[PDB]
């Protein structure tokens, strides 16, 4: 219930369970990771999709179990000059295995010239930075894309939302529910002395 009060979104298409039925199914492990990309790069963040930033920084497999939460963020990461802190890596060797981060600083070689630190006509720096100005349009603005991934069959369920507690009714034959212990009866105060672990 504290998910949809975080500004209007930009992309919330999902490839699995409904976002409203997440309370009805209790999970055990959920993953959380976030990054920022240009608004022209939000489209290819999907299971089985190609593009510029599709196979060189972050890839998604066929099994997803979740979806992204992308919204507009132009008054924290946008300056009248530049915002060069965020960058994307596109001069990579080969295909990237999905759900695997990678950090490197060696200069990529696109030819047969052995580059061991130099940047020639074929060797380029593999880390290219963005540029974030108000002069740029809506399709050239940073969006804080965050994706949630769910894991199954590792442990019994431990993570899921509220249980909708209600009031108490006394001296009336009603049905109740106490931590999964169902039954019908009349609630009455006791005189026994329970041990503080039962």
């Amino acid at each position: 219930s504290v998910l949809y009060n975080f500004a209007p979104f930009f992309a919330f298409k999902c490839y699995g369970v409904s976002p409203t039925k997440l309370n009805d199914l209790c999970f055990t492990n959920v993953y959380a990771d976030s990054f920022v990309i240009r608004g022209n790069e939000v489209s290819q963040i999907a299971p089985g999709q190609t593009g510029n930033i599709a196979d060189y920084n972050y890839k998604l497999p066929d099994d997803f179990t979740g979806c992204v939460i992308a919204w507009n963020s132009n008054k924290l990461d946008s300056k009248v000059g530049g915002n060069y802190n965020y960058r994307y890596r596109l001069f990579r060797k080969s295909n990237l295995k999905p759900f695997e981060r990678d950090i490197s600083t060696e200069i990529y070689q696109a030819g047969n010239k052995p580059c061991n630190g130099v940047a020639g006509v074929n060797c380029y720096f593999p880390l290219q930075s963005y540029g974030f100005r108000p002069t740029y349009g809506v399709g050239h603005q940073p969006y804080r894309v965050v994706v949630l991934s769910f894991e199954l069959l590792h442990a019994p369920a431990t993570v899921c939302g509220p249980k909708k507690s209600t009031n108490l009714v006394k001296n009336k034959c009603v049905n109740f529910n106490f931590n999964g212990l169902t039954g019908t009866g009349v609630l009455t105060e006791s005189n026994k002395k329970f041990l503080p672990f039962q």
Partner: antibody
Amino acid sequence: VQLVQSGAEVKKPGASVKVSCKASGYIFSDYNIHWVRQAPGQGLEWMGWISPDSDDTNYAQSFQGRVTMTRDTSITTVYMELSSLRSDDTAVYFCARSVGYCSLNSCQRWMWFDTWGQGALVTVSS
Amino acid sequence: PVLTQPPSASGPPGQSVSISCSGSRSNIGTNFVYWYQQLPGAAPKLLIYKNDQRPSGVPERFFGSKSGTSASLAISGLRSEDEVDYYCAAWDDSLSGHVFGAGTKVTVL
């Protein structure tokens, strides 16, 4: 842009000095101001950047605690409290303007020093 | 490591002159080289940034280039009334600080 300030007063060894160059004509929350000294007859040495929003600054390999750093968003002017002035500190102090924003240690390679103007005179002398 | 520059540049007017700034393997090539020049008794001013763009305020008169370990700042002739010292700047990841050159002052013959 402008970088006019007042001349720094001469300090004996074992003292404290404060220098600050005025910032106006823009908003002081998007460009990180730098500082550098011009030693006579040789090059320059650098100690770190000042982001004018939060505490994320760093220090160089040769300057650990000899420089202490302080921001001020009410006046939009950075402040400095220099300590342990020796004979190697005798140089004019210039605040170097920078373009863009850089918080980490790998984002300033595209950054270039924008504007220099009217530094102060600092001479450490017994 | 330290960055070295010639103490002075011997340049006759009317002919092309250039300066070299040799550094280290982690200082030049992987990072861009910036050239700075200062007036005598005044503030410095950047000359070349990112090795192929030039700032607004200078005519099409100067050129800068980088080739491996050393970077060259080619100058198309020399004006006798305008002589300034030149600087070389780069970045080193191991030192984690900006490094500046010694300073090359052009001198007429």
